[PDB]
Every structure is written in structure tokens, then in C-alpha cells.
Amino acid sequence: GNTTSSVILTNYMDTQYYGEIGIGTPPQTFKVVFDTGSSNVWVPSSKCSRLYTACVYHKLFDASDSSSYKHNGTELTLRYSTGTVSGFLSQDIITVGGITVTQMFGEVTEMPALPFMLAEFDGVVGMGFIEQAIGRVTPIFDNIISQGVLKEDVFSFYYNRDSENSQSLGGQIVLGGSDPQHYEGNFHYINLIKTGVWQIQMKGVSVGSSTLLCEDGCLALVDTGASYISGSTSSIEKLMEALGAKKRLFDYVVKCNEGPTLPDISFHLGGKEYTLTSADYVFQESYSSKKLCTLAIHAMDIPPPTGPTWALGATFIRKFYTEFDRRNNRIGFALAR
Ligand SMILES: COCCCC[C@@](O)(c1ccccc1-c1ccccc1)[C@@H]1CCCN(C(=O)[C@H]2C[C@@H](N)[C@@H](O)C2)C1
Ligand SMILES: *[C@@H]1O[C@H](CO)[C@@H](O[C@@H]2O[C@H](CO)[C@@H](O)[C@H](O)[C@H]2NC(C)=O)[C@H](O)[C@H]1NC(C)=O
Numbered sequence: 001g002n003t004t005s006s007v008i009l010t011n012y013m014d015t016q017y018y019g020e021i022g023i024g025t026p027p028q029t030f031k032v033v034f035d036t037g038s039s040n041v042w043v044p045s046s047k048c049s050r051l052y053t054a055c056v057y058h059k060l061f062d063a064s065d066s067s068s069y070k071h072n073g074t075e076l077t078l079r080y081s082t083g084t085v086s087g088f089l090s091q092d093i094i095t096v097g098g099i100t101v102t103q104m105f106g107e108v109t110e111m112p113a114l115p116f117m118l119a120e121f122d123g124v125v126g127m128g129f130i131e132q133a134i135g136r137v138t139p140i141f142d143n144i145i146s147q148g149v150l151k152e153d154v155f156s157f158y159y160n161r162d163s164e165n166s167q168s169l170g171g172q173i174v175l176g177g178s179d180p181q182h183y184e185g186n187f188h189y190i191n192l193i194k195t196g197v198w199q200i201q202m203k204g205v206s207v208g209s210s211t212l213l214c215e216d217g218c219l220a221l222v223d224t225g226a227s228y229i230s231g232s233t234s235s236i237e238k239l240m241e242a243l244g245a246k247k248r249l250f251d252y253v254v255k256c257n258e259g260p261t262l263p264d265i266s267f268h269l270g271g272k273e274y275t276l277t278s279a280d281y282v283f284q285e286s287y288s289s290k291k292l293c294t295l296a297i298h299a300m301d302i303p304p305p306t307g308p309t310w311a312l313g314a315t316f317i318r319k320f321y322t323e324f325d326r327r328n329n330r331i332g333f334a335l336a337r
Contacts, residue, residue, distance in 0.1 A: 001149035005097030006179065009034075009171025010120075014162045014283070014296075015227040017171045017314060018121040022095040023105070024066030030059055030122040034157070034173055035225030036198045036324060037311065039133035040078060041094070041140055043123035045087060045107035054111040058122050061090075061107055068093045068102075076106040078134055081300060086110035094140065096125075097175055101144050104137045127155065127224065127324070131196030145326065150176030153327040157224055158182040158336060159317045178332075183321035187332035190270035195329050197306060198222050203268035205235070205310075207242045219309035220269060221302070222322060222331055226313030229281075230300040235310070237299070239265070245295060252298060254282065257289040265297075267312070274333065280319055 009019045010031070018031045023043065030043045046062040048055035063069045072089040087108040094103045108123070125140055126133070133139050145153050156178040159171045172179065178187075190200045202220040205213035213235050231239065243262055245252045254262065259282035266275040283294045296315040301308060323332035 001147075002151055003099065003149040004151050004174060004176040005099050006175070007097045007173045008169065009159070009173060011160055011162050011170030012120045014314065014318075016120050017159055017224075019171070019173065021125065023061055024063075024092050025068040026066075027095060028059075028061055028065070030061070031120070032123045032125045033121050033225055034127055035124050035223070036127045037221060037223040037225045038078075038080075038124065038126035039128035039130060039139045040076075040106060040126045040135075040137060041103060041124070042076075042078065042085060042087065042106035042108050044111060045109050047107065048109045048111060052111050053113050054116040054119075055108075057117065058111070058119070063090060063092075063107070066092055072104070074135070076135055078106065081302070082115050083112050085112075089135070089137070096140075096144075099144060099147070099149065099175060101140060101147060103140055103143055124225070128198060129196040141326070144175065152176055152325075154178070154323055154325045156321065156323045156332075157317055158321050159314050161318060178321065178323050178334075182337055183334035184337050185334055187323055187334045188270055188272055189325070189328075189330040189332045192329045192331065193219075198324060198331060199306070199309060200269060200331060202310060203271070205231075205239070205268070206264075206266040206273070207239060208263040212242060213239060214310070219307070220267070221306065221309045221311045222316075222324070223311040223313050224317065224322075226311050227315070228296045228298050228313050229315045230298055230302075230311040230313065232308050232310075233299040233301050235299075236297065239297070243295075246292070248292075252295045253292040254295065255289055256284065256286045256291040256293040259284055259293050260287070267310075267316075269333075274316075274320065276316070276319060281315060 007019045046060045070091040156174045199221045262278040321336040
């Protein structure tokens, strides 16, 4: 086909990127994270008890207001590093961009306050493989591919730095392509280790000149769902020591004045060095030697089979425009802009 649709994304604080979808006839809109590290679709359900405050504070899908709704009702449970969500399956039509797909999704009836009380978004749309879908539900992208409408069986992500401007575009995703308004040059493509996970090999991780980490190779997941770059607790501890970074209950910090002179961090992928300066990795609120500044890196030990792995989140994606290629099982990187 020729279709290459686009969805605009909202950037909240540089930690949440999300966009709109519509479910049903007439369409009920939701804000969703597009997550390459998961494969399922869910939104909150009108059936969610208001005993869950998250279901109070977020938008709820009402099956009964939709003509295209088809009952299934099979129980679903989804696990994330943080929250666990529960519900049942429903089928309805979902619009992304200009594309309309009949999809199977979870309607969530149990949403914990941690973490969804902290979400600026309603639900998630997983962009991962069926291999990782809970319940073996066909994921939304596969269904689109089935539709046979995209130009190329790929999708791409642009993530932006948060701006004060109203005009400024927080993010964009493209279905079936990439937008070259947002990258310079040509893509460098790295093959997936295997189909079913958006994960690739990483040669090393460098703090400065010296090759400190993942020195004998490691794994890299390219995760649009993730805010920060993540590594193993061991990998991260050492990298953090290398920066003189300090550990706090939620985050890693440096004195706000010392951030600019921190060493670059390079990720070696596909034979090329992908480099983030401290300007990419410190949230520099002030430059006071008196204040402490957050780094956008943290530890997350992701268990097997996917882990241990690094996850390359928005901190990375902000620098590098990312093309996810379903046909060729490759991920492409280009310089964002
Ligand atoms: C760029 O947009 C980021 C959106 C926010 C992601 C997130 O920051 C978040 C913040 C506040 C409330 C909820 C959630 C959140 C929680 C669960 C699922 C989706 C979003 C997540 C915090 C927990 C760890 N981290 C992930 O493991 C990630 C791993 C990834 N695969 C996802 O499934 C979750 C990201
Ligand atoms: C909801 O989806 C489930 C899971 O895909 C359906 O269960 C399957 O239905 C087919 C076709 O009738 C059976 O042959 C399979 O063996 C079933 N799978 C399992 C795991 O039980 C279910 O039928 C659908 N429900 C409704 C109400 O439409």
C-alpha cells in the first residue's frame, strides 16, 4: 500500500511521551504510551471500581457506548517492572493516525496508584512482538500489517526535548516510515538478535576514553516505553561511581554545577559509537553547586528471558531517531532533529 500515517506525541517533563488513540464507534479517545518493550494494548475500563483512584483520575473505556464492540471477557493480567494491571479482553476498532484496525485489547479493572496515579497517560499500546504478548493476543502492529496498507512494514519514533513553547512538537510516531524532517543523514541499521524482541547486541559502554562496561558485550533493548536509560544494577553502580554520582531514594544525582563537565557516555552498537554528552543526560535545573541534579539513567534489572539487558529509553531516543523495522528485523538509528 501507500499509507504512511503519523501520530503526534506529547512530552511531559521529558519522562512521558504519549499520543492519542480512539476506541469504538463513536471513538473514545485515550492517551497511550507507545511501548516497544511490551506487546499488549490496554486502557482503563468503565468497569474499574473507583476504589482505584487511578480509574478515577484517568479516562475510562465504556463498551456499551460503542457499536463496534465485541465481547470476549477473558481475563488478562499484565506485569511491568512497576505496576501490575488486570482486566479482561474486548474487541473494538482502534484508530491510530489514519489507520483503523480491529483490535483485541485489555480493559483494565484493577489499576494501582503506584504507578498510574503518576501517569499523565491513560493506557499503553505495546509495539512489541507477539512472542511477548500476554495471552498470545495479536499485537496492534501485526494487525495493521495484515491490513496491507503501509508503504513499508516499519515504524519510527521521534522524541523531543521539552519546551516552554506551545508550538514545539513533543514527539512523533510514524506508521510505515520515517519522517526526514526529524533526522539527518541516513540510517545505520542493526539487526535484531532474534525476532520477537526489539533487542540488539551491544559491544561496550564507555565512560570517556576508557571502556568501562559491557566490555565483553551485552544486550540492548530499544524501549520507547522507558524514560531513562537502564542497566544492570552492577553495570549502573560502576558507571555511577565513574561519574561521582550519588544515590538517593528515587534517583541518581550530581551537584547541579558539576554536570556539564561530566564525561560522555558512549554506547557501542552496530560497530559505531553512539554518544551522549552530559547535556543529553543531566536534567540541569540550575547550575548551583548547592543543588543536586538528576541523571536520566537508573538501574533496572530485567529478568530472563529478556534480561539481563540495557534498555535504551527516551534519554537515548531523544538523540537518535529510531526506525523499527518489522520486515527486515532491524533497528535503524539516525541523528534526531
Ligand atoms: C517515554 O514514555 C515513558 C512513559 C512513562 C514510563 C514510566 O516512566 C512511567 C511513569 C509514570 C507512570 C507510569 C509509567 C509506566 C509504568 C508501567 C508501564 C508504562 C508506563 C515507567 C516507570 C517504571 C519503569 N519504566 C518501565 O519499566 C517502562 C519499560 C517500558 N517497556 C514500559 O513498559 C514501562 C518506565
Ligand atoms: C475470546 O478469545 C479467546 C482466546 O483467543 C477465544 O477462545 C478460543 O476460541 C477458539 C474459536 O472458537 C477456540 O477454538 C480456541 O480453542 C479458544 N482458545 C482458548 C485458549 O480457549 C474465545 O472464543 C473468544 N471469546 C468470545 C466470546 O468471542
